Amino acid sequence: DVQLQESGPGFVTPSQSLSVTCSVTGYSLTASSYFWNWIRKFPGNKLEWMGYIGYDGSVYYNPSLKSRISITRDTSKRQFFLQLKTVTNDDTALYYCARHGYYSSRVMDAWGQGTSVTVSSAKTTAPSVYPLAPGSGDTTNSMVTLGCLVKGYFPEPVTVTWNSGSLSSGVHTFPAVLQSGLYTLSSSVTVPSSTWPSETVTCNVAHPASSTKVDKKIVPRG
Amino acid sequence: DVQLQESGPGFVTPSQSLSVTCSVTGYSLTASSYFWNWIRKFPGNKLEWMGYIGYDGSVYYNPSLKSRISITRDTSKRQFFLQLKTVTNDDTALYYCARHGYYSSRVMDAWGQGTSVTVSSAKTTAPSVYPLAPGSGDTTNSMVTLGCLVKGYFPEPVTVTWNSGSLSSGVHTFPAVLQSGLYTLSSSVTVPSSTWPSETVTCNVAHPASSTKVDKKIVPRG
Amino acid sequence: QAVVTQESALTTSPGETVTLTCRSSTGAVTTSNYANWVQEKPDHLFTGLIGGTNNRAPGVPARFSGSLIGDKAALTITGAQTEDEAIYFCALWYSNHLVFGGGTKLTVLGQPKSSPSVTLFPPSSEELETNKATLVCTITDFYPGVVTVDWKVDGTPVTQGMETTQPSKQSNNKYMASSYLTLTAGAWERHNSYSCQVTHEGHTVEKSLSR
Amino acid sequence: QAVVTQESALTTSPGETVTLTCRSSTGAVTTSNYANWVQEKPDHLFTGLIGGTNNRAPGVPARFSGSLIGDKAALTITGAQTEDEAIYFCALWYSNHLVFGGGTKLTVLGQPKSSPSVTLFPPSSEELETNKATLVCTITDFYPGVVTVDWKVDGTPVTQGMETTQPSKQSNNKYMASSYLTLTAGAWERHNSYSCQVTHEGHTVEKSLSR
Amino acid sequence: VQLQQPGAELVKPGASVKLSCKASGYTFTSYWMHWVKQRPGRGLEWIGRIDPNGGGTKYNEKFKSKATLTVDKPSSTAYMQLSSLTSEDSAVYYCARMWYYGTYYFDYWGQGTTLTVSSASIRNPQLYPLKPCKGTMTLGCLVKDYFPGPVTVTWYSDSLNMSTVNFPALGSELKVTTSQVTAKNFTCHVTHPPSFNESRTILVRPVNITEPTLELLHSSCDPNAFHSTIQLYCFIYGHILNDVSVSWLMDDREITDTLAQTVLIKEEGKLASTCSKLNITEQQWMSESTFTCKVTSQGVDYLAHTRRCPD
Amino acid sequence: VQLQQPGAELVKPGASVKLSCKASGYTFTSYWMHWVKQRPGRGLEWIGRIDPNGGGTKYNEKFKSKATLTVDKPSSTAYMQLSSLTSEDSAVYYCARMWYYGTYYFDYWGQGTTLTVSSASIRNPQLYPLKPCKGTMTLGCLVKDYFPGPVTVTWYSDSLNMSTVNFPALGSELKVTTSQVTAKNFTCHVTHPPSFNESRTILVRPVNITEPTLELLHSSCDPNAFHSTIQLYCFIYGHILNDVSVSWLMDDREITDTLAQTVLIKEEGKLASTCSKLNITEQQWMSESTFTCKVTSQGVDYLAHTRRCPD
Amino acid sequence: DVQMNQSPSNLAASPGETVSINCKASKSISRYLAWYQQKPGKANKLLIFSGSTLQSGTPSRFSGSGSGTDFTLTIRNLEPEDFGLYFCQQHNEFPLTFGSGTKLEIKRADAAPTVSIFPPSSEQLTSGGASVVCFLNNFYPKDINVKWKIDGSERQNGVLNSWTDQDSKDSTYSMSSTLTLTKDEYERHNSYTCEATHKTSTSPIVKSFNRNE
Amino acid sequence: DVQMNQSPSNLAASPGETVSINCKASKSISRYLAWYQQKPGKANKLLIFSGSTLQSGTPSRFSGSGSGTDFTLTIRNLEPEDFGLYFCQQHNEFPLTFGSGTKLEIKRADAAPTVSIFPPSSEQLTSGGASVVCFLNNFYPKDINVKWKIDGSERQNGVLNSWTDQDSKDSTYSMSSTLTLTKDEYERHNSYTCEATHKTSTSPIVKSFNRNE
Ligand SMILES: *[C@@H]1O[C@H](CO)[C@@H](O[C@@H]2O[C@H](CO)[C@@H](O)[C@H](O)[C@H]2NC(C)=O)[C@H](O)[C@H]1NC(C)=O
Ligand SMILES: *[C@@H]1O[C@H](CO)[C@@H](O[C@@H]2O[C@H](CO)[C@@H](O)[C@H](O)[C@H]2NC(C)=O)[C@H](O)[C@H]1NC(C)=O
Ligand SMILES: CCCCCCCCO[C@@H]1O[C@H](CO)[C@@H](O)[C@H](O)[C@H]1O
Ligand SMILES: CCCCCCCCO[C@@H]1O[C@H](CO)[C@@H](O)[C@H](O)[C@H]1O
Numbered sequence A, B: 001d002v003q004l005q006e007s008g009p010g011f012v013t014p015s016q017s018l019s020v021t022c023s024v025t026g027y028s029l030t031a032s033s034y035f036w037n038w039i040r041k042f043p044g045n046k047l048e049w050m051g052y053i054g055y056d057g058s059v060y061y062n063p064s065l066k067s068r069i070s071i072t073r074d075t076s077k078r079q080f081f082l083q084l085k086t087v088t089n090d091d092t093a094l095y096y097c098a099r100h101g102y103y104s105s106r107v108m109d110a111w112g113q114g115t116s117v118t119v120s121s122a123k124t125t126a127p128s129v130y131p132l133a134p135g136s137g138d139t140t141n142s143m144v145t146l147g148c149l150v151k152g153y154f155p156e157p158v159t160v161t162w163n164s165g166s167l168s169s170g171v172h173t174f175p176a177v178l179q180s181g182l183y184t185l186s187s188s189v190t191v192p193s194s195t196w197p198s199e200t201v202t203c204n205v206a207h208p209a210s211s212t213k214v215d216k217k218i219v220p221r222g
Numbered sequence C, D: 001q002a003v004v005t006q007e008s009a010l011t012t013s014p015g016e017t018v019t020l021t022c023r024s025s026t027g028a029v030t031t032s033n034y035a036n037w038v039q040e041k042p043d044h045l046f047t048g049l050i051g052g053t054n055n056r057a058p059g060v061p062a063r064f065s066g067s068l069i070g071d072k073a074a075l076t077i078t079g080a081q082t083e084d085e086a087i088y089f090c091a092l093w094y095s096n097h098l099v100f101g102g103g104t105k106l107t108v109l110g111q112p113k114s115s116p117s118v119t120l121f122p123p124s125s126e127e128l129e130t131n132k133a134t135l136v137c138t139i140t141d142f143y144p145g146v147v148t149v150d151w152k153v154d155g156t157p158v159t160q161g162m163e164t165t166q167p168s169k170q171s172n173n174k175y176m177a178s179s180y181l182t183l184t185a186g187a188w189e190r191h192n193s194y195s196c197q198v199t200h201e202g203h204t205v206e207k208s209l210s211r
Numbered sequence E, F: 001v002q003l004q005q006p007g008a009e010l011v012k013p014g015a016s017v018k019l020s021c022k023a024s025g026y027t028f029t030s031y032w033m034h035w036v037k038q039r040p041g042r043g044l045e046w047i048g049r050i051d052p053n054g055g056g057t058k059y060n061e062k063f064k065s066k067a068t069l070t071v072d073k074p075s076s077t078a079y080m081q082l083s084s085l086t087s088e089d090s091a092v093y094y095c096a097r098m099w100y101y102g103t104y105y106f107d108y109w110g111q112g113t114t115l116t117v118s119s120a121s122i123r124n125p126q127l128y129p130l131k132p133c134k135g136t137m138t139l140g141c142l143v144k145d146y147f148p149g150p151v152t153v154t155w156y157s158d159s160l161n162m163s164t165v166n167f168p169a170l171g172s173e174l175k176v177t178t179s180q181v182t183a184k185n186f187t188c189h190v191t192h193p194p195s196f197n198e199s200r201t202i203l204v205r206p207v208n209i210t211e212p213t214l215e216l217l218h219s220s221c222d223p224n225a226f227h228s229t230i231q232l233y234c235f236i237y238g239h240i241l242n243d244v245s246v247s248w249l250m251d252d253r254e255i256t257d258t259l260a261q262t263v264l265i266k267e268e269g270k271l272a273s274t275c276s277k278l279n280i281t282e283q284q285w286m287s288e289s290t291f292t293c294k295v296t297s298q299g300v301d302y303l304a305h306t307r308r309c310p311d
Numbered sequence G, H: 001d002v003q004m005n006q007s008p009s010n011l012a013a014s015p016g017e018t019v020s021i022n023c024k025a026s027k028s029i030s031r032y033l034a035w036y037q038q039k040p041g042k043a044n045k046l047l048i049f050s051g052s053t054l055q056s057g058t059p060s061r062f063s064g065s066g067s068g069t070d071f072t073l074t075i076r077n078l079e080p081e082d083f084g085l086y087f088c089q090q091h092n093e094f095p096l097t098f099g100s101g102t103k104l105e106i107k108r109a110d111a112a113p114t115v116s117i118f119p120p121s122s123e124q125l126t127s128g129g130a131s132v133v134c135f136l137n138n139f140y141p142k143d144i145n146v147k148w149k150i151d152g153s154e155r156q157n158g159v160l161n162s163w164t165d166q167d168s169k170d171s172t173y174s175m176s177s178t179l180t181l182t183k184d185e186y187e188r189h190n191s192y193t194c195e196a197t198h199k200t201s202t203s204p205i206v207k208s209f210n211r212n213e
Helices: C185-190 D185-190 E282-286 F282-286 G122-127 H122-127
Strands: A003-007 A018-025 A035-041 A047-054 A059-061 A069-074 A079-084 A093-100 A108-111 A115-119 A128-132 A143-153 A159-162 A171-173 A177-179 A182-192 A202-207 A212-217 B003-007 B018-025 B035-041 B047-054 B059-061 B069-074 B079-084 B093-100 B108-111 B115-119 B128-132 B143-153 B159-162 B171-173 B177-179 B182-192 B202-207 B212-217 C004-006 C009-012 C017-024 C036-041 C045-051 C064-069 C072-078 C086-094 C097-100 C104-108 C117-121 C133-142 C148-152 C162-164 C175-183 C194-200 C203-209 D004-006 D009-012 D017-024 D036-041 D045-051 D064-069 D072-078 D086-094 D097-100 D104-108 D117-121 D133-142 D148-152 D162-164 D175-183 D194-200 D203-209 E008-011 E017-022 E031-038 E044-050 E057-059 E067-072 E077-082 E091-099 E105-109 E113-117 E127-130 E138-143 E152-157 E162-166 E175-181 E186-191 E199-203 E213-219 E230-240 E245-250 E261-268 E271-280 E291-297 E300-306 F008-011 F017-022 F031-038 F044-050 F057-059 F067-072 F077-082 F091-099 F105-109 F113-117 F127-130 F138-143 F152-157 F162-166 F175-181 F186-191 F199-203 F213-219 F230-240 F245-250 F261-268 F271-280 F291-297 F300-306 G004-007 G010-013 G019-025 G033-038 G045-049 G062-067 G070-075 G084-090 G102-106 G114-118 G129-139 G144-150 G153-155 G159-163 G173-182 G191-198 G205-210 H004-007 H010-013 H019-025 H033-038 H045-049 H062-067 H070-075 H084-090 H102-106 H114-118 H129-139 H144-150 H153-155 H159-163 H173-182 H191-198 H205-210
Touching: A003 A093, A018 A035, A018 A093, A018 A115, A035 A069, A047 A069, A047 A079, A059 A069, A079 A093, A108 G045, A128 A212, A128 G122, A143 A202, A143 G114, A143 G129, A159 A182, A177 G159, A182 G129, A182 G159, A182 G173, B003 B093, B018 B035, B018 B093, B018 B115, B035 B069, B047 B069, B047 B079, B059 B069, B079 B093, B108 H045, B128 B212, B128 H122, B143 B202, B143 H114, B143 H129, B159 B182, B177 H159, B182 H129, B182 H159, B182 H173, C004 C086, C009 C017, C017 C086, C017 C104, C036 E105, C045 C064, C045 E091, C072 C086, C097 E044, C117 C194, C117 C203, C117 E138, C133 C148, C133 C185, C133 C194, C133 E138, C133 E175, C148 C162, C148 C175, C175 C194, D004 D086, D009 D017, D017 D086, D017 D104, D036 F105, D045 D064, D045 F091, D072 D086, D097 F044, D117 D194, D117 D203, D117 F138, D133 D148, D133 D185, D133 D194, D133 F138, D133 F175, D148 D162, D148 D175, D175 D194, E008 E017, E017 E113, E031 E067, E044 E067, E044 E077, E057 E067, E077 E091, E127 E186, E127 E199, E138 E186, E152 E162, E152 E175, E175 E186, E213 E291, E213 E300, E230 E245, E230 E282, E230 E291, E230 E300, E245 E271, E271 E291, F008 F017, F017 F113, F031 F067, F044 F067, F044 F077, F057 F067, F077 F091, F127 F186, F127 F199, F138 F186, F152 F162, F152 F175, F175 F186, F213 F291, F213 F300, F230 F245, F230 F282, F230 F291, F230 F300, F245 F271, F271 F291, G004 G084, G010 G019, G019 G033, G019 G084, G033 G062, G045 G062, G070 G084, G114 G191, G114 G205, G122 G129, G129 G144, G129 G191, G144 G159, G144 G173, H004 H084, H010 H019, H019 H033, H019 H084, H033 H062, H045 H062, H070 H084, H114 H191, H114 H205, H122 H129, H129 H144, H129 H191, H144 H159, H144 H173
Parallel strands: C009 C104, D009 D104, E008 E113, F008 F113, G010 G102, H010 H102
Antiparallel strands: A003 A018, A018 A079, A035 A047, A035 A093, A047 A059, A069 A079, A093 A108, A093 A115, A128 A143, A143 A182, A159 A202, A171 A182, A177 A182, A202 A212, B003 B018, B018 B079, B035 B047, B035 B093, B047 B059, B069 B079, B093 B108, B093 B115, B128 B143, B143 B182, B159 B202, B171 B182, B177 B182, B202 B212, C004 C017, C017 C072, C036 C045, C036 C086, C045 E105, C064 C072, C086 C097, C086 C104, C117 C133, C133 C175, C148 C194, C162 C175, C194 C203, D004 D017, D017 D072, D036 D045, D036 D086, D045 F105, D064 D072, D086 D097, D086 D104, D117 D133, D133 D175, D148 D194, D162 D175, D194 D203, E017 E077, E031 E044, E031 E091, E044 E057, E067 E077, E091 E105, E091 E113, E127 E138, E138 E175, E152 E186, E162 E175, E186 E199, E213 E230, E213 F213, E230 E271, E245 E291, E261 E271, E291 E300, F017 F077, F031 F044, F031 F091, F044 F057, F067 F077, F091 F105, F091 F113, F127 F138, F138 F175, F152 F186, F162 F175, F186 F199, F213 F230, F230 F271, F245 F291, F261 F271, F291 F300, G004 G019, G019 G070, G033 G045, G033 G084, G062 G070, G084 G102, G114 G129, G129 G173, G144 G153, G144 G191, G159 G173, G191 G205, H004 H019, H019 H070, H033 H045, H033 H084, H062 H070, H084 H102, H114 H129, H129 H173, H144 H153, H144 H191, H159 H173, H191 H205
């Protein structure tokens, strides 16, 4: 058995250096005939094999990335590292480390989960949290969908709960959309329209990159 | 240094088996990467590579000779043997053994002298020896060429001397010509025409295949 | 009484020169004060640097020099190293006693940013034999020395028993800290996934365990 | 006196049966003669085969049998082997003495022709210290047992000291012989190349030396 | 040179404490011994100076009614006794060397003794070993509940390149120590005044795997021979003496028809080196099919792949 | 069973000779001992029969005035003494066993003693060692001039599979013996009656060469790697411990730019095994150039040639 | 480089059915083509390599065929675990290249979306901006269209859409749509409407609000 | 098989001159062609292999060139030891094949043959046959022609010729010619003549005998 785990910076400024680590468990980086690769997926689901370092220390890179990338290793830590110099927005991708060499014909026999890297000329931003309440009156004992708009934050991720997890069911959290240099996300919870006027319906939004934790109570409009 | 020496039967009857031995001196028949070949030259100076046995015991034959030839070896005697089955007159040749494998690209680095093999449906025959004397009178103190005709013998060779080797100089022994199944040869010695009438001029003809030794004195004609 | 005053904090770049001064309330510092300069580094390590007004102690690099400038004593570091980042104390002798200053915090710039190394320890079997539990999240070797810690077990812990220490400077001029999540043994047996997140300069290093 | 008579020579092929007889001048051979059959092979090796008139000796193969046929004693070999080629002697007892026959030469056919193995030895240093020399040409393992020997040093030796032995049968039923060339020590130092030729069935095996 | 001071002391209000400072590695009677007080978050205060050669004691006027200096030549130890102790005296007390002859300068200091003056109750430490939890050697000890304030930690090991980190405490009085290891056993030792509440806890998780080296060689065509036998040689160097298992594959499918010859080359104590030979045909090698020797040892699959050089 | 008789005896005319026949491997007093005469080119003549158990002697009427039979039980030896000896008595005399109880038959015979009766002078043998003369081990001895007639030869060796051939004599009284050997020393011993004219001559030509085994292996492309380092391994097994010299060639031209690594693998007493490693480029191997490791040991050139498999 | 073209990009099926994915190669890759599978929240897993060779753990219901420039992965008797992402990789030569990938989603009964429109909050209008939100929760199939209307006029600028993955419990989809205006522009109008066109209704599901309190 | 065509079959030269021998190949043999040399009474000796590579013992005056299907051996500054037989062997593939060979003879001054005719002996005529012999000793160049004439009529049947190798001492040639008749045919005629045509004389050298005693 072998386990590969990626570890990255999350986000990087253009023209800077990108560095990603792959920690390996179960096997040695010098065990005979194994090769350790860096591969990456672009947002349009295109995979690009970047390169590899071998059990013997040899390296080989995709010619389209030559002079930019460097793959190194620490065998006592059982880690191997990808460095990509002068990153641009076209380097934004999900980076995997893989292992091939169990089979004979250049086939990845182990994969890591992958780490996301956004190359953006943007800084850490805490989100603005707005309430989402209906613009009309509710019929008695109906169902009401309330929500929270988590707007203008960077980077990913953000964690949204409802009443500190008490409202577990009926929750929809949508994938964030990146506009300008900021993310916008919407969360919703469906509760009885009789629960809302007598009890508290609050969304808890946590953005750890800015150490932000905010509570937004959904108050009916007038 | 390596020495290769051939040893054959001299002559063989058609439809019989031909067997030739090559004795090797200086090197082992199992020394690493050496190959021992049989090659043969036909009367018209055409050479034909017959085959080889290797240091490892492997053999390979000319496809034109396959199913007929067999190459074997005795490594304690340091000899290797060629056997050719069902010989015909087209198998009459001068058989060499050779060694290649010192250089890398299939080149004979050692040769033996070669042994002659005549495939002929003929038996051992002692020669008839006739004198060769002029058909006219000689001028006094001139030079006279006398000779001996050694006709109708098989097989080769035959040894012709003059006065038991006393007449060494002025001797011409011509290569035998094979007509029907018999050889014909002529020998000549040039002596002062004053020596012939007062001394003995005799040719000694020796054919060891028939254990024949004859003396023919050249007597003037009348 | 007589008091001694130094600058609160100074900042120098590697290779530059820096001067730290030491003023007396009596008026002017002289050679009779025996202006001493001592260096303090993490883990309560004090090292005497200079005595007299310029008498360098054995084992002290030559880049440290002492002098009297104006009415103050002065310690000059010519060609500062990153190892020189420390707290520098002045000491003046008055008749029958010695008076220290407040100390100057000398920071050396140019040091690169360093992301924290994080280790997450689950509770031992001996603690689980009690009715409580303590997950331990140690953090080392981060620079600058400001860091925040969050925990994740049930999605978004709000209070629980999340506690952290203040950043403390290591001997390599990096910083260390530790975080703790105290829960009950029943709560430990109830939940399975546990994670410690450590945010530094906007980047998060995360460790996790289960069972 | 009483004499015993056998055939001069008989010839059999391997696998066949052959009968050798033994006649007495007294008239008829009986059981009182104790007709003995003995076998002689090369190197003067005698082996008793049969006693009485049919009493096979221990160690003798069963294919040898004895009997009385007509007025003669008889030894029958049923399924002859190539090892049976030998001289067979009969022996009859008369009152106070035993009388042998002349013996029968039994030849076994089917034996393949064998070319001679030839070895040429130069004279030793000890013989060259004298005023003579002897080159030795040994010949073994040839069949049939007729061979001729020539020498070659000066082209065609006529007399010199060429001498040969008569072919002698070996225990393997092949033949052996030896040839000698006696010359003088001065003649040895004068000439360089020496060769012995051995002609058998029209084929010549040749050995040579120098120095 | 080393100035050994106790880690921490504890007294009740109004009592007296005797702090020590043991000398080592220098002439005891050639240096002045100063005592300096530091309260947390504050600067330094000089208390007294003592001359070990004679009886030359000199005190700051502020500490004359509280401090007494003593020197012990046979023990090579300086002493400072504090009387009339209050919470105003809870602080770290350092001893320091000063050179007298020629120039006046400081050099060596002690680590300081943390004196706490309190009448509060005492809570002794709880030592819990921190389980590394597989996925990395990182050991540690958690000192949970303890009190008057101070806690000290040391580590034992069966040698090795070992680093240790002692972390600051919580306001709720919790402490953690950790140890990173570069195959032995480990334990931690904690002291908590008053007296010597020396507790200790052990832990270990060992490993043992030997990684062999694979060399997959190939016998190619002899240019002097018409036919050559193509043979693959799987050399396994430095494996465990009694644990190695070799199988062969062609195009990643296991070979079961052809038999391989696996023999021992060499033995070196508890290690060994072997070679597995496998014959293949010239057609199979020319077909540019792949060939693998899969070596299994201690549950680990090492492999070697080969193929004729294409193009 | 063995009936030992002397090889040959010599007497003068009119004298008397005592021939013997020593028993071995059987009950001496349970068999009859016959004496049979054979002259060269003639048949057999029976002389006498003696019963070793008693004194039962019986003679042919023709030999009664010449022959006397004797039996020696303590020596287990039969004897026949011949008197009134002439040239008519020169012959080979055999002793033979005959079984008496039950059936009457012969079985074991002796080798026979050659008795020569002559007044001629004696010529003792001249032993010359026959030099094999290089080109083949074949040793031999030439017994040149000797005379009354008989000569016997035996051989000594330091064991080994050895065959010997004793050749017939010339009419001029010359003899030759030869020995074929399958690394020791050899000598021949000749006896020539009258008495024991035992002469001896020695000879030897030793050899000593060890032939190592060459394996030229090749590291091919790993199909999982884009670039592979092509390396040639010249294994030399079983060479002389302190005599081996390895050089490398490409297309039969010696390589001097690239350095090879030649190391010792194993030592086994006076033998050893080494390996020479040489790196070549992928282009050089793909170019189908030949590569050779030439190993020189004890003046012998062993070689190994390799090349990528063509087509 | 070898360019791999994978087709189709999306497949919908029920457990027990048979599906097939195809990969074309811009140049001959012999037999060296591999198929990998990724389940939601799991790492990529190699299924087949060298065109038809399965890993030991790959179920027999997965098979591969083809050569040269045409390769096909067939999945028979679909189990619920088989729904996810599949992609091909040529392993004939370096650099190793991949295909676009195919999403195999599980089928379910058609479900109409729950549509809900939300006006901008006072907190956001304080800063000068406004965001009108429209939710379409728990619908199938994924095909759905949204039209923003302000006073009856269609609006296409300032719109962002976000779809969820197929739900792991009820196999439905959810979609959010945010229309961003300035406060000045938002306060120029009265009626705000989002229309949701889906297979489950001939007429679009309409949700509206009036800016008037 | 590869067929090697060697040219020319005969060369004549003096020491110090330069000669060249050529071998064509029926198919490309790359550079693998070897040249071997044989001296009278000596074993074959490898001179050059792989087209241009010399053995360590091959003198520098021997060189080789060519490739594909055309190869040439050049010998400069001929030494007396260089005269003999030369032949080429392709060593590109099995079976190894050879060329016809080239004889390099040494030149000398033109020499007229000593011509001598011999009638049949009484010993041979006793058996019923007859052999008339004609010798041509010590001539150069080798080119020579013999015509048998019986009573002036040319005779071509029953003639056998035998030439010697180039003499190792005087570089000349000798030739024997035997005409075989029956006794009945031999005794039908009177004048027997052999004419020898050689470069050294415009008219042929004529030797005759009369059958009459
Ligand atoms: C591989 O094949 C070779 C033959 O090419 C084998 O070597 C032969 O082994 C036999 C005994 O089985 C010997 O009699 C031969 O002399 C050997 N050949 C040579 C040239 O020495 C070898 O054993 C085979 N090995 C494997 C693992 O299959
Ligand atoms: C042949 O080349 C290899 C490299 O392909 C050499 O091995 C390297 O040797 C150096 C030391 O000189 C090491 O630092 C490398 O780690 C080695 N490479 C690997 C992959 O281990 C080898 O020494 C060369 N051998 C010869 C005889 O030239
Ligand atoms: C038990 C066997 C473990 C072998 C570990 C070898 C790790 C390093 O191995 C080699 O060391 C060289 C040092 O110069 C590096 O240059 C090479 O890249 C590396 O392959
Ligand atoms: C010192 C090393 C000498 C090695 C001599 C090996 C001679 C025989 O070697 C092998 O023996 C086999 C026997 O079955 C034969 O079949 C093989 O043809 C032969 O190569």
